[PDB]
Design an enzyme around this catalytic site. Structure first.
Site, PDB file in Angstrom:
ATOM      1  N   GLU A 208     -22.468 -43.105 -35.750  1.00 29.12           N
ATOM      2  CA  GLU A 208     -21.889 -41.989 -34.827  1.00 29.12           C
ATOM      3  C   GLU A 208     -21.584 -40.758 -35.398  1.00 29.12           C
ATOM      4  O   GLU A 208     -21.754 -40.599 -36.658  1.00 29.12           O
ATOM      5  CB  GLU A 208     -20.757 -42.423 -33.738  1.00 29.12           C
ATOM      6  CG  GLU A 208     -19.578 -42.746 -35.051  1.00 29.12           C
ATOM      7  CD  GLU A 208     -18.466 -43.761 -33.918  1.00 29.12           C
ATOM      8  OE1 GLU A 208     -19.078 -44.569 -33.502  1.00 29.12           O
ATOM      9  OE2 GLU A 208     -17.136 -43.556 -34.361  1.00 29.12           O
ATOM     10  N   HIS A 246     -12.544 -42.169 -32.001  1.00 29.06           N
ATOM     11  CA  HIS A 246     -12.209 -42.892 -33.158  1.00 29.06           C
ATOM     12  C   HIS A 246     -11.577 -41.594 -33.963  1.00 29.06           C
ATOM     13  O   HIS A 246     -12.185 -40.445 -34.191  1.00 29.06           O
ATOM     14  CB  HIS A 246     -13.572 -43.426 -33.834  1.00 29.06           C
ATOM     15  CG  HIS A 246     -13.980 -44.655 -33.115  1.00 29.06           C
ATOM     16  ND1 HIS A 246     -15.517 -44.745 -33.127  1.00 29.06           N
ATOM     17  CD2 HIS A 246     -13.591 -45.766 -32.786  1.00 29.06           C
ATOM     18  CE1 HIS A 246     -15.674 -45.576 -32.492  1.00 29.06           C
ATOM     19  NE2 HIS A 246     -14.403 -46.555 -32.070  1.00 29.06           N
TER      20      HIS A 246
END
Ligand SMILES: CC(C)(COP(=O)(O)OP(=O)(O)OC[C@H]1O[C@@H](n2cnc3c(N)ncnc32)[C@H](O)[C@@H]1OP(=O)(O)O)[C@@H](O)C(=O)NCCC(=O)NCCS
Ligand SMILES: CC(C)(COP(=O)(O)OP(=O)(O)OC[C@H]1O[C@@H](n2cnc3c(N)ncnc32)[C@H](O)[C@@H]1OP(=O)(O)O)[C@@H](O)C(=O)NCCC(=O)NCCS
EC number: 6.2.1.5
Lengths: 286, 385, 385, 286
Positions: A208, A246
């Site tokens: 990601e 995150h």
């Protein structure tokens, strides 16, 4: 399979806590060889049938465990990682989210100098479908098989796990490297293991936004990975400059975007899939 | 989290680093009284917002009289300043910084960040001060020197002289730069920062170094051990929904789109918005359900998302959790009636009782569409909208 | 360099570590006024000398009335206390420590030293408190647990709990011990100490930890960066000749012998006294000429050595240097006449002009014997004496 | 010969100082290949004919030097050792006496992790009679030959140098490891080099009170050293508990006495000589 197996004897640091108890009951159910656990102060007691010790060394001399899973809150994590390493554990799997980056900076240097392996922090953990579960993942989706998965995100891993099971492939070992900025193991440390794993026939690599490890891996793959790798990157629609849940998910310096990473994976001759829904498909094709 | 300029400056002072004499003010009365506490003018008046590009936006001026101070303060206090790095609304200016004007001979750039690639704190210096360092990297990347703190030893003076020399500084300024490298590296480490940007660090017409601007970023994860820094946060600079979301263990970031996404997992939430983008949709936000999808948590999530009014349909997408797929469908069905959602909701459940749950949804009679898979779920909302 | 007890205690206080309430006193008037500042007695009165074995020597008593305080203070202030670790003269007691008496449940041992073998600071703990740890090592070495600070990470709490457990402590005392391990390791590092010995560290009848004694050793080489510690040195506790020697760049340590050795090189000075011992002599001191053997330096050296009156002959032995063997022989010949040495001096010169120099010596007419080699030089003094 | 030779190009950190100037003029006389030196601030000048640089990296890129000799006062030593290591020097020889032990503690760890070699601190330095002198020793006593010497003291080394020259043996390489408590190289790192040195036929090992390295070496010799070693230990008459001039010379804890060390050398089958005067003799015998 890599890292863990039907034989890995595991201890839990944070054993008597909420998550420690919960997710240890499930590993136990799974057949994971939990041999005992650590909570300072509670040594001499027994929890989930297993003995509870006062210090990781006490636990290791008693049980012979070589792996440890850590469910200790951020504030004391670094002390519990350092303790583990000092007591002779060789594999650490840290679920704990919220560790200060600079704590991770130093622990990583110590990990490497001492040759101890850490998966995490901030990660779903590790499963060798069939033999070993250490982590929080729901084991009923897995199936012993030939694909190996490394991801920078937990639930995202479950999408791929569930496709490779449905398409009948199953998994050698699923590995979550965590979503923090400085994890104890990157893609490269893990691709190198899969490549050398005979049970591993193809590799699913899920990443990601932020950082440059995917790129760093794109280039190691090209030179040192001979199994086929299908890659997916979550982030394409991410705003530049914000932390996307995150802690390591942020496009810092207009750098590390989803598109750069796909683009660097392609070159390495990686089968990038632009819809997470097609991981099953693409591997069928490989 | 980010710090204001005036807040960085005050930290710099605590560690003995040079900054101009200045006062942070909240009423124009304080802004014009600062004039004579500082000295003879002229003076620099600066809007305090977390964003960059204030100079260009009109938020930084040099002025010659108390009258012009009062006038800037009156023109900005309470307004929102929009800079190329803020959104359409800019950020509220609730504070003006009035400092002594500076005699600039040369402008350098001194910065530090945590380098993920090397796993080190890295200080970068350069002679091109007063310029986005991003431009300088791609453009004249050779005009940037770096050093990397060693974790075993902590910052050392040879690293600071090393860079002083690379910048062509000589003499007392080499040592001066060195002390400044030692102090920042120590602040960085001691306060768990994530970023330092002194741009420009200025050589004065009189031959001294002085940090003219200051831009700090602390690491959110260490606040548990940085009480003072905890206290310095300016919530007003943030989208209030983000802080509101965090209270209920969610992770919102808003966007420009007609389609809402409620997912459990930051990686999954991003994958989901990409899947919706990919099938012609325009995601309106990232939402990552932190705690289990309880009714009460599921409800909040609805409020936050639907606080934006361009929102046209909501895609909820849940793979797994500590709550049974049928229990969530209840919570959803509940949220919709009680929060009063008037937009179609497409919902992909996946896990235990998934099938059971998708039936409660369908039978509900509300305008909740159960998708048969994710790709289906995407197509329907995109379609719904 | 060594610290007094009362000085260690005061440092412990600055870092928040437990010690009894006590006052350091210089006149008996202060010693008996401390009684009521502390509380109800009884009280412990202790002679402050750098040496151990004070308890046994009479320098530590528990007393019940102000009258006994005044009496101890009167009996010791200005006297020299001789303990099994001091010499024949003991050390001057210029200060008495009066502290609250302690309710001892158990006595533990907590210490740290720099382990040359591992190249680490090593903390050692044990259950045998109130005993020379040297005895415990050879005797019940298993009753001692150790940890080693890691240079990359600094002391960590698992090391402190680790040891707490090994000592069988449980509960609040585990954490209490832990905090004390964290504080000492930090003092050790921050102040460049070389040694810490808390013996005993005591568990009180009330269940708390308290450092009852404290014995610090700082590292002489860091004083350049420990100003406060620089100020705490008690010269009176040292042989004044040693400090006198150091001013003129020499390294004296006195002994029981009739033969003086002046050499250039600590390794050479030790080899020389051993060669003299070996041929029946008894060396009276170690002297290592630090700066080049100039006349003025050579002279001082004579004074220091001959300050002892059992000295019967002086062996000077010089191999090399930044002063030509003939120039030293002059300085020597000079020192002897001007300092008035009335003892035979045997002299081994070796280097440039050695032969030339040994001739000036011989021709001098003074009672200076030029040796033909070292073994010869040894035999002659031994003989001279 | 070990460590240095007619080819070692050397730079001096502290070049323009008193000792730096003095002892650099002598190396230069000796034929030592001093290629230049470092004093921050004085870069761009030239001293003893050699160019003077601002930072060790500047010097290394300019000259290709791989060794450095450091004559910088205690207070800044650790910073100058760390700089050297960071600039890519592989051999450091530190004369500087008075370095705080804890500074040495950390520098040693860094030395080893980075694989850089330090001789010292507080040491006379290194000489390969015939080709290279870095240090303060008087070179006119040496003679190219077959004995190798390692000592924990400077002038004491000169006694042995002068015997092995007189008895006609001469020396391969003389090495002074320094008198501090934690030196950058011990006896063992050095015995291992001599053992592998063909020009080295016997080894003279000179030590003294304090520490336990001689013992540690006594036991490595027995197992891994096949050339003959004659050992002398200065200290027998030393008081217990006082620092005998060298900072590491002290019998701490009634441990590390002269006699223990002789006694441990004998066992290893070392030719201990109890009079420094007989080093020549004993080797004649070997
Ligand atoms: C780590 C985490 C799971 C802990 O939460 P918890 O189990 O809810 O916390 P508890 O306080 O209930 O338990 C922690 C235990 O650690 C113990 N403990 C504290 N310090 C410890 C140490 N150094 N060694 C061992 N145990 C320690 C505590 O005492 C406690 O157990 P106890 O209650 O018996 O005393 C939580 O911080 C967390 O990180 N949550 C996010 C997890 C996550 O999202 N991971 C990402 C996966 S994709
Ligand atoms: C190291 C020692 C020799 C320095 O003494 P000195 O040469 O008398 O000292 P100076 O001040 O004259 O020179 C030191 C030089 O270091 C320079 N310097 C300081 N920090 C430095 C750095 N980080 N990098 C490079 N040079 C540095 C100084 O600027 C100075 O040179 P300058 O005068 O041109 O400015 C002295 O401390 C010493 O250790 N003496 C004992 C030596 C000994 O007994 N060794 C044991 C052998 S057996």
């Amino acid at each position: 399979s890599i890292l863990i197996d039907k034989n890995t004897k595991v201890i839990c640091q944070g054993f008597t806590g909420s998550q420690g108890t919960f997710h240890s009951e499930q590993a136990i159910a799974y057949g994971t060889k939990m041999v005992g656990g650590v909570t300072p102060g509670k040594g001499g007691t027994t929890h989930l049938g297993l003995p509870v010790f006062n210090t990781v060394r006490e636990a290791v001399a008693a049980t012979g465990a070589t792996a440890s899973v850590i469910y200790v809150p951020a504030p004391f994590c670094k002390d519990s990682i350092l303790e583990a390493i000092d007591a002779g554990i060789k594999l650490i799997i840290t679920i704990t989210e919220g560790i200060p980056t600079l704590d991770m900076l130093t622990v990583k240097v110590k990990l490497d100098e001492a040759g101890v392996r850490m998966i995490g922090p901030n990660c779903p953990g590790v499963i060798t479908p069939g033999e070993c579960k250490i982590g929080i993942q729901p084991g009923h989706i897995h199936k012993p098989g030939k694909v190996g998965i490394v991801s920078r995100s937990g639930t995202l891993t479950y999408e791929a796990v569930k496709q490779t099971t449905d398409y009948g492939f199953g998994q050698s070992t699923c590995v979550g490297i965590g979503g923090d900025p400085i994890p104890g193991s990157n893609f490269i440390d893990i691709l190198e293991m899969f490549e050398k794993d005979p049970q591993t026939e193809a590799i699913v690599m899920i990443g990601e936004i932020g950082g440059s490890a995917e790129e760093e891996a794109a280039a190691y793959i090209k030179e040192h990975v001979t199994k086929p790798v299908v890659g997916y990157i979550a982030g394409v629609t991410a705003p530049k400059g914000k932390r996307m849940g995150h802690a390591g998910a942020i496009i810092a310096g207009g750098k590390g975007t989803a598109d750069e990473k796909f683009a660097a994976l392609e070159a390495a001759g990686v089968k990038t899939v632009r819809s997470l829904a097609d991981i099953g498909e693409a591997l069928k094709t490989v | 989290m980010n710090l204001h300029e005036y807040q960085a400056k005050q930290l710099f002072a605590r560690y003995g680093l040079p900054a101009p004499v200045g006062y942070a003010c909240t009423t124009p009365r304080e802004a014009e009284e600062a004039a004579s506490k500082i000295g003879a003018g002229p003076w620099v008046v600066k809007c305090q917002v977390h964003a960059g590009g204030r100079g260009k936006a009109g938020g930084v001026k040099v002025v010659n009289s108390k009258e012009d101070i009062r006038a800037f303060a009156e023109n900005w206090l309470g307004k929102r300043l929009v800079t190329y790095q803020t959104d359409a609304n800019g950020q509220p200016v609730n504070q003006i910084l009035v400092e002594a004007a500076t005699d600039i001979a040369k402008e350098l750039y001194l910065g530090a960040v945590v380098d993920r690639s090397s796993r080190r704190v890295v200080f970068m210096a350069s002679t091109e001060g007063g310029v986005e360092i991003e431009k300088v990297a791609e453009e004249t990347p050779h005009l940037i020197h770096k050093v990397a703190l060693d974790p075993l030893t902590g910052p050392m003076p040879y690293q600071g002289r090393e860079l002083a020399f690379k910048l062509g500084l000589e003499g007392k300024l080499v040592q001066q730069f060195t002390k400044i490298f030692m102090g920042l590296a120590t602040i960085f480490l001691e306060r768990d920062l994530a970023l330092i940007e002194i741009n420009p660090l200025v050589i004065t017409k009189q031959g001294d170094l002085i940090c003219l601007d200051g831009k700090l970023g602390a690491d959110g994860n260490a606040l548990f051990r940085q009480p003072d820094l905890r206290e310095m946060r300016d919530q007003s600079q943030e989208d209030p929904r983000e802080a509101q979301a965090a209270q209920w263990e969610l992770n919102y970031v808003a966007l420009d789109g007609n389609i809402g996404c409620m997912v459990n997992g930051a990686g999954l939430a991003m994958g989901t918005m990409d899947i919706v983008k990919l099938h012609g949709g325009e995601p309106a936000n990232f939402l990552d359900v932190g705690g289990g999808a309880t009714k009460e948590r599921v409800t909040e999530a609805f409020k936050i998302i639907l606080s934006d009014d361009k929102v046209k349909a909501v895609l909820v997408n849940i793979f797994g959790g500590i709550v049974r797929c049928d229990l969530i469908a209840d919570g959803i069905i509940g949220a919709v009636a009680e929060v009063g959602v008037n937009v179609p909701v497409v919902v992909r459940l996946e896990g235990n009782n998934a099938e059971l749950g998708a039936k409660k949804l369908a039978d509900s009679g509300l305008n909740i569409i159960a998708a048969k898979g994710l790709t289906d779920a995407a197509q329907q909302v995109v379609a719904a909208v």
